[PDB]
């Protein structure tokens, strides 16, 4: 006859929210079918669904969302899927890889690859993605899957755990008319099985209005009408209004609240033929998953596959460093030991630390461009904050921060002719690696939690300029006054320029035919590399060389702890 | 005002399209991928005329000589300014579009006529509004756009989608004014996208276009009756506006295109079918509007004086006390290199001078507001003068009496003129690239990668004399090099850095370099007074070269 006997209802009685008050008296039940929450954008159309699930703060509402006469159970995260309005699924991965990534984190670890492969192929067969799963999704740069199946594959990541009460946030925004009915036929097909498809459409059509089972109208937190969708036009026809011939039924309800206002329609539905039945049923009915290794493996795997398939930012960063080091070694080719050798040595050493410190602005776009995905998967039951922070860090700050540092010193070293030593080559390589790591770690301590990329970049270029002045070349570090010399310890390029300067100006002379390593007659000459280090404020002991390394290592852990605390205390609602 | 076009064959998007336009209220419909938006641009003089293959005549006579002076065109974006009130921006278009014969006694009467016919009497004493200031919302933002194009009494009006991004609360309100103004004889031709039944009941002439093919043309009352006999039937409680779009999309264009040529609405269609001012007035009005937009923005003008005042106070606080010793040369060349570097890198914020108002320049150039030379001279007079000369004149009057460079009357003006010419040439170089582009992402990275290249050739990171011969010629194509060499020549001159060692006549023990001249020769700078002014004539030649490139890029643009 049919296909199901009962469904998981979701009843609510007196829903009041305040942030100040955004919802007043909202009540009604949601029978298992395909119900919709209509209304304008200024009301609680897109805000009722956030309180219907677990998307808002518990200290803001005062009602109660009962599920079959019982409150929200503990398996609700695994029995309800929320579909985000904007894009969520990555474009650098295919449909099978996107479904397998969420299937490996949402399902339990007791399931092998046999049940997970047939579960993914089952969702693919119901989603109609047999020929799409074998292709990449695509983004603004590569083409693969158009927008007709982007919303289909976005909901496929939620049907992995076989939910009962599926939630959607405007599933028709960003589509046309053919794809709206294509995506709605699948929702009606899944609704006929036994799912409670609740969403909030925005200005639909008659071909989509006829498919709704229930309908709730909201306008500025006031319940205007709640009942079947077929009886919505008949209720307003005897209340004082009447729709015209050849008119959209959904547009007539939105035209009534606008002026064919909000104080007379709220006092109409409270004493009608649809409020006493709902109040009679409402008072009757009302009176992590995986381990840390599996999360750190699948998160770093998806981030590494995303970084490998993005040639516009990974390979371009290597070409911009290869052509930079080639033109640097070509200009400084021939570092002689004369009067001009000190200016060439200090300029080539200062430019390497300034370029490594100013190239960390590109690393800011790491947590800000994927903020909606982190706040969506974290409150859904995917991983924790430490697993996401370590998975994105092990896949982005390691192969893109250490690669331009090693290729930048293996070319200009044998090309310039700094110090022909085996240990000196590895010292400046490790110094540039610690400089780029500390600058990117400082970049992550500012952009964590924010969304606007213009403020994190304006504040970073401002503090990078202030740290660039205190490096040791534009101004001497010993002539600064006492109430300002303490600011030299709060920089980044200074530790790199100090360790880079100590590694070269050592047993090198700078005056031809004037041995001044034991006797320097006529002062004010600087005829050795040691006189330049003391003239700038550098210690000649070997401890002074490793002091900047132990200072940059401490600044790395401090900035990473601040970035982790900023991601832990973030508002996930 | 009976517009009529023949078979328009547009391609690079159109095929066969013909039909008269009744002087009443015409509406163009169709999908976004069709030729709905391209019909309004090809119906007037806003598209490529060489890619046309049809004939457009206006009541017998074709396009007259004053079609731009008797026809209006609006856009769904912005043609108005937010920092200016609705009474002065409307008068700005009234001073450029009208002749000088119209006195002020009759000019304000026409302005009050639009402020009384449109319905903006209470808004005449308020501004429009941007992202910071508050004026009006989106309801009044569309009234001043049509009001700007409603200066003279026209005959044919064009409107590119006058409902996109407009709520349904005032959608019928902004559409009723079009039918109210259409009763006098305004051939209002708009391209509405996805209407409703409340907008579909007042249409006087409908024109459905899809994939460059004409689907239906005639009255709107007979639109639903034509498709009833073609093989379709509308359902109850359904909007007939978007219903015609579902038939085209497929609940296709190869069977609905020829079905209209053999109907009754097509046989009856082919029956009847077969500058002002001067250069000074445009420069004064453009510079006045751009100057008013400058003083009206407290986020783009006053913020730059604070970003240069704190920088000038922290520089004078760090370098306070430039003593003459062994370390005096490093502090002097470092503070002098930072002035030309900050002044050259501050030109990145001036790249948003021509790329933001690009739609305003193309839309004002097509209607016949001014010319391409008056907009350039009017913009470089009220933008590159009070914002490019103020931070250079205040960055030198603070650090000169705080650092202690050369206490001379003439060297203070040399340092001020050097920083002014450096900032003028850096902003002129960024203007030769942003002029002509609409994207700000590519124009903001090329200036950083180019300025970082000129930063190496300045004369501090690498000695200029030690560069090989096949690469030393690259130092001439820089900007901070001329400013740094002029500031070094102006500062290092009669200075002595050796304490208790008079080396002006006798300098025993060489390899010392402790005079103001032993450092200039070692850096590559001449001691003659001509060597000081050589960088000034080089920056002056590069200013005129980059400004000529920016003007040629603004002139040779696809303004269609």
């Amino acid at each position, epitope marked *: 006859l049919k296909a199901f006997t009962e469904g998981a209802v979701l009843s609510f009685h007196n829903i009041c929210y305040r942030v100040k008050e955004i919802l007043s008296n909202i009540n009604g039940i949601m029978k298992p079918g395909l119900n919709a929450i209509l209304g304008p954008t200024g009301g609680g159309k897109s805000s009722l669904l956030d309180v219907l699930a677990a998307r808002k703060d518990p200290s803001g509402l005062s009602g109660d969302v009962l599920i079959n006469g019982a409150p929200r159970p503990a398996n609700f995260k695994c029995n309800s899927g929320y579909v985000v309005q904007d894009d969520v699924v990555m474009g650098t991965l295919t449909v099978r890889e996107n479904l397998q990534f969420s299937a490996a984190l949402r399902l339990a670890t007791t399931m092998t690859n046999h049940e997970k492969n047939e579960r993914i192929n089952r969702v693919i067969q119901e989603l109609g993605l047999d020929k799409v799963a074998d292709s990449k999704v695509g983004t603004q740069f590569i083409r693969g899957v158009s927008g007709g199946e982007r919303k289909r594959t976005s909901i496929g990541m939620e049907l992995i755990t076989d939910p009962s009460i599926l939630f959607l946030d405007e599933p028709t925004t960003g589509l046309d008319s053919s794809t709206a009915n294509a995506v709605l036929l699948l929702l009606k097909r899944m609704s006929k099985q036994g799912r409670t498809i609740i969403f909030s459409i925005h200005q639909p059509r008659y071909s989509i209005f006829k498919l709704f089972d229930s309908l709730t109208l909201l306008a500025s937190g006031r319940l205007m009408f709640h009942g079947p969708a077929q009886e919505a036009l008949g209720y307003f026809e005897s209340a004082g209004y009447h729709c015209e011939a050849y008119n959209n039924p959904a547009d007539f309800f939105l035209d009534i609240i606008n002026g064919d206002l909000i104080e007379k329609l709220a006092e109409i539905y409270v004493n009608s033929s649809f409020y006493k039945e709902t109040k009679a049923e409402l008072h009757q009915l009302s009176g992590y998953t995986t381990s840390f290794c599996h999360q750190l493996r699948w998160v770093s795997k998806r981030s590494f596959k995303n970084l490998l398939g993005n040639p516009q930012a990974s390979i371009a960063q290597i070409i911009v460093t290869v052509v930079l080091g080639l033109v640097i070694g070509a200009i400084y080719f021939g570092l002689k030991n004369d009067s001009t050798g000190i200016q060439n040595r200090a300029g080539v050493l200062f430019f390497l630390t300034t370029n490594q410190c100013f190239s960390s602005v590109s690393a800011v776009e790491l947590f800000v461009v994927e903020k909606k995905l982190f706040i969506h998967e974290y409150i859904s039951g995917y991983y924790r904050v430490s697993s996401y922070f370590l998975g994105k860090l092990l896949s982005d700050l390691l192969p893109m921060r250490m690669l331009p540092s090693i290729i930048f010193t293996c070319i200009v070293y044998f090309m310039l002719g700094l110090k022909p030593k085996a240990d000196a080559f590895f010292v400046m390589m490790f110094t540039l690696m610690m400089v780029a790591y500390s600058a990117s770690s400082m970049a992550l301590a500012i952009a964590a939690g924010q969304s606007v990329v213009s403020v994190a970049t304006l504040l970073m270029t401002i503090c990078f300029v202030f740290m660039m002045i205190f490096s040791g070349l534009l101004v001497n570090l010993t002539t600064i006054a006492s109430w300002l010399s303490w600011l030299q310890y709060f920089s980044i390029p200074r530790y790199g320029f100090t360790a880079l300067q100590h590694n070269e100006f050592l047993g090198q002379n700078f005056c031809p035919g004037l041995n001044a390593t*034991g*006797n*320097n*007659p*006529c*002062n*004010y000459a600087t005829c050795t590399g*040691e*006189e330049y280090l*003391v003239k700038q404020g550098i210690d*000649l002991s070997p401890w002074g060389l490793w002091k900047n390394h132990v200072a940059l290592a401490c600044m790395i852990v401090i900035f990473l702890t601040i970035a982790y605390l900023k991601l832990l205390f973030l508002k996930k609602y | 005002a009976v517009l009529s076009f023949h078979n328009i064959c547009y391609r690079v998007i159109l095929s066969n399209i013909n039909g008269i336009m009744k002087p009443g209220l015409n509406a163009i419909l169709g999908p976004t991928g069709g030729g709905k938006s391209s019909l309004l641009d090809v119906l007037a003089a806003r598209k490529d005329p060489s890619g046309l293959s049809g004939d457009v005549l206006i009541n017998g006579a074709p396009r007259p000589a004053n079609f731009k002076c008797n026809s209006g065109y609006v856009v769904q974006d912005d043609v108005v300014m937010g920092t200016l009130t609705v009474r002065e921006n409307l008068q700005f278009s009234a001073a450029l579009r009208l002749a000088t014969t119209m006195t002020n006694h009759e000019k304000n009467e026409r302005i009050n006529r639009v402020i009384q016919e449109l319905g903006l009497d209470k808004v005449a004493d308020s501004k429009v509004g941007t992202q910071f200031i508050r004026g009006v919302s989106g309801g009044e933002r569309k009234r001043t756009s049509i009001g700007m194009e409603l200066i003279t009494d026209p005959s044919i009006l064009f409107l590119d989608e006058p409902t996109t991004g407009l709520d349904s609360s005032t959608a019928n309100a902004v559409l009723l004014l079009l039918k109210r103004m259409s009763k006098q004889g305004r051939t209002i031709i708009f391209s509405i996208h996805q209407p409703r039944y409340s907008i579909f009941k007042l249409f006087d002439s409908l024109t459905l276009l899809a994939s460059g093919r004409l689907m239906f043309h005639g009255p709107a009352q007979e639109a639903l009756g034509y498709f009833e006999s073609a093989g379709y039937h509308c359902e109850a409680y359904n909007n007939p506006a978007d219903f015609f779009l579902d038939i085209i999309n497929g609940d296709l264009i190869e069977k609905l295109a020829e079905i209209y040529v053999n109907s009754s609405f097509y046989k009856e269609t082919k029956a009847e079918l077969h500058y002002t001012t001067s250069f000074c007035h445009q420069l004064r009005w453009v510079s006045k509007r751009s100057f008013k937009n400058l003083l009206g923005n407290p986020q783009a003008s006053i913020a730059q004086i604070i970003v240069t005042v704190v920088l000038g106070l922290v520089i004078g606080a760090i370098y306070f006390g430039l*003593k*003459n*010793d062994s370390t005096g040369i490093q502090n002097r060349a470092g503070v002098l290199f930072f002035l030309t570097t900050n002044q050259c890198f501050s030109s990145v914020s001036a790249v948003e001078l021509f790329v933001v108002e690009k739609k305003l320049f193309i839309h004002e150039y097509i209607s016949g507001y001014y010319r391409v030379s008056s907009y350039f001279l009017g913009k470089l007079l009220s933008d590159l003068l009070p914002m490019r000369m103020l931070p250079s004149i205040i960055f030198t009057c603070i650090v000169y009496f705080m650092l202690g460079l050369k206490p001379k009357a003439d060297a203070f003006f040399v340092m001020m003129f050097t920083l002014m010419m450096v900032a003028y040439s850096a902003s002129s170089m960024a203007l030769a690239i942003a002029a002509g582009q609409s994207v700000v992402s590519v124009a903001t990275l090329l200036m950083t990668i180019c300025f970082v290249f000129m930063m190496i050739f300045s004369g501090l990171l690498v000695n200029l004399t030690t560069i090989a011969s096949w690469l030393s010629w690259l130092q001439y194509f820089s900007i901070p090099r001329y400013g740094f060499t002029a500031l070094q020549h102006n500062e290092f001159l009669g200075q*002595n850095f*050796c*304490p*208790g*060692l*008079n080396a002006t006549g006798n300098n*025993p*023990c060489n390899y010392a370099t402790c005079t103001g001249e032993e450092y200039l020769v070692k850096q590559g700078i001449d001691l003659s007074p001509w060597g000081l002014w050589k960088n000034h004539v080089a920056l002056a030649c590069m200013i005129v070269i980059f400004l000529t490139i920016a003007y040629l890029k603004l002139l040779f643009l696809k303004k269609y």
Partner: antibody
Amino acid sequence: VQLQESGPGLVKPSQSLSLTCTVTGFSITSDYAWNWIRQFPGKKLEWMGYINFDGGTTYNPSLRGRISITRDTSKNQFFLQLRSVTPEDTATYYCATFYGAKGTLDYWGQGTSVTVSS
Amino acid sequence: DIVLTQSPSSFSVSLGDRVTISCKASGYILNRLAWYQQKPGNAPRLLISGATSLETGFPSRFSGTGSGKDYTLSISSLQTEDVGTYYCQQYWSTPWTFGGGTKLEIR
């Protein structure tokens, strides 16, 4: 080459002190600079400040606004104003020279014992 | 600043002995220390300039070595015409500071 220290030796506290060291056999603005060294009543020395041949005067940070070296080209003399004198500044003042390139103070002065008492 | 310390404030040598006077410092001097010799009743005459060479008018018995942060003045065959107080002055930076004083005393 040859210097000669002269001035008062009994100054009241909380007042001013002025010394004068003439230079014979060399110019005062030729090449060498001139300092002011005091030997405390005991076995200690302190460098007060110096004046370059052109007019550059670098003082000691210990004397905050108390030392003022002033020169004269005609008589080839350089003085030393010490305002707000204290009883602990009863040191014997000398006037040494300073060749920039060797760097050391070669020629010195005889020195004058300055007593600060009431 | 760069302070100059001297551990032996008073010596007790004899006649014809190797007098070892040492003077360390706080900062790096790099062979910029000068030695002085003040007689009981005169002006401090310059002895060793640069802590390496030796001025004229003095015998070759005065020799100054040491490099880095400490400098040592050696006297070979000390007689009775070498008594007095010795000092160690630096001239690396601008606040030139002297040393203590090693007053020699014969027995």
